[PDB]
Design a protein around this ligand. Structure first.
Ligand SMILES: *[C@@H]1O[C@H](CO)[C@@H](O)[C@H](O)[C@H]1NC(C)=O
Lengths: 108, 49
C-alpha cells in the first residue's frame, strides 16, 4: 500500500509570500494520478490540482502543481486571505486503490 | 409463385431454401479486469509536440 506523506507538517507564512508544499510517496506514483485538495474548516475538500499539474475549474492561476516519481509539489505564488487552509495530496488511478496525505496547514 | 403461374404441371420444383435459424446469441470476451487508462491521453496537462 503506497503511503503519501506531506511536508512540512505545518507551514507558517505571511500573506503575499511563496508557499511550497511537498508530497512524498513510498513508491513511484504516476504523475497523471496525483491530486491536490484545499479544505477550509467546516467545508468539504476542494479539488485544486489533478494530474499533478492541471488546475480545476475556477481555481486561481497562483496555484501550480509539478513533480514526478516520488516527489510532488504544490506551489502558491502569492498567498491570499483565502489560501490559508488544510492541503491534502491524493494518489489515485484507474484501479480501486487510492491514498491521501496527512494534511499540511498553511497559517498566518 | 416460383413458376410465376397459377397452373403447375406434374414434376418436382425447387421453390425455396431451408435454413435453421439461430436460437440465441452467445458473447465470449476475454476475462479482463482493468480499465483502459485513456484519461492520461485525452486529459493530459501538456500534449507533446
Ligand atoms: C475472471 O477472473 C476473476 C478474477 O479476476 C475470477 O474471479 C473469475 O472467476 C474469472 N471468470 C472466468 C469466467 O474465468
Amino acid at each position: 500500500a503506497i503511503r503519501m506523506t506531506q511536508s512540512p507538517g505545518t507551514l507558517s507564512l505571511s500573506p503575499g509570500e511563496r508557499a511550497t508544499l511537498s508530497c512524498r510517496a513510498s513508491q513511484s506514483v504516476s504523475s497523471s494520478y496525483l491530486a491536490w485538495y484545499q479544505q477550509k474548516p467546516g467545508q468539504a475538500p476542494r479539488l485544486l490540482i489533478y494530474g499533478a499539474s492541471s488546475r480545476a475549474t475556477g481555481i486561481p492561476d497562483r496555484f501550480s502543481g509539478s513533480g514526478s516519481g516520488t516527489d510532488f509539489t504544490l506551489t502558491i505564488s502569492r498567498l491570499e486571505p483565502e489560501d490559508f487552509a488544510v492541503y491534502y495530496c491524493q494518489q489515485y488511478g484507474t484501479s480501486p486503490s487510492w491514498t491521501f496525505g496527512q494534511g499540511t496547514k498553511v497559517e498566518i | 409463385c416460383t413458376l410465376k403461374s397459377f397452373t403447375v404441371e406434374k414434376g418436382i420444383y425447387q421453390t425455396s431454401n431451408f435454413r435453421v435459424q439461430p436460437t440465441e446469441s452467445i458473447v465470449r470476451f476475454p476475462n479482463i479486469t482493468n480499465l483502459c487508462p485513456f484519461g492520461e491521453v485525452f486529459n493530459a496537462t501538456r500534449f507533446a509536440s
